Design a binder for this molecule. Structure first.
Ligand SMILES: CO[C@H]1O[C@H](CO)[C@@H](O)[C@H](O)[C@@H]1O
Length: 158
């Protein structure tokens, strides 16, 4: 089991960490969602589907910088919504193919009432998402840590 980003940054068997740089809607009004859909940028696969089933959760999602200060967050994982920053490990998604499958994580971030102006700074860390991979074969319990960075400013109109 290993993962890679759209631009080809890899985290190999056994886990590790990588930086993910995301383009964000440049203007987001109060009452609207800023959507950060990581399923278009993070992909994983099973290296031995003939014998092994891989299990993958969002173990933890943390918010940083402007997202922590200026947004009210929800994370959608494989079709179900949970609070973000997260309060529990998600259910598992099964990985059972050698063909790359997206990691079905999307953040939905809506501005809090106090938010206004540059609510997310370009280049800033906005989230850390921990992918936890286990299997039905051995005791492997690996963390794939995704550090999410903003590519651009996000303005919340006032
Ligand atoms: C062969 O072992 C590797 O590949 C399998 C299947 O993906 C994983 O379950 C395991 O943790 C290792 O990453």
């Amino acid at each position: 089991f290993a993962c890679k980003t759209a631009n080809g940054t890899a985290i190999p068997i056994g886990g590790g960490s990588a930086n993910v740089y995301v383009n964000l809607a440049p203007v987001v009004n109060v009452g609207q969602n800023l959507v950060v859909d990581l399923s278009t940028q993070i992909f994983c696969h099973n290296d031995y589907p003939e014998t092994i089933t891989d299990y993958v959760t969002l173990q933890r999602g943390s918010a940083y910088g402007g997202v922590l200060s200026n947004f009210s967050g929800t994370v959608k994982y494989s079709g179900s919504s949970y609070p973000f920053p997260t309060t529990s490990e998600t259910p598992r998604v099964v990985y059972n193919s050698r063909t790359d499958k997206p990691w079905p994580v999307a953040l939905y971030l809506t501005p809090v009432s106090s938010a206004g102006g540059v609510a997310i700074k370009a280049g800033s860390l906005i989230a850390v998402l921990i992918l936890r991979q286990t299997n039905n074969y051995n005791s492997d319990d690996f963390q794939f840590v995704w550090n999410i960075y903003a590519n651009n400013d996000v303005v919340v109109p006032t």
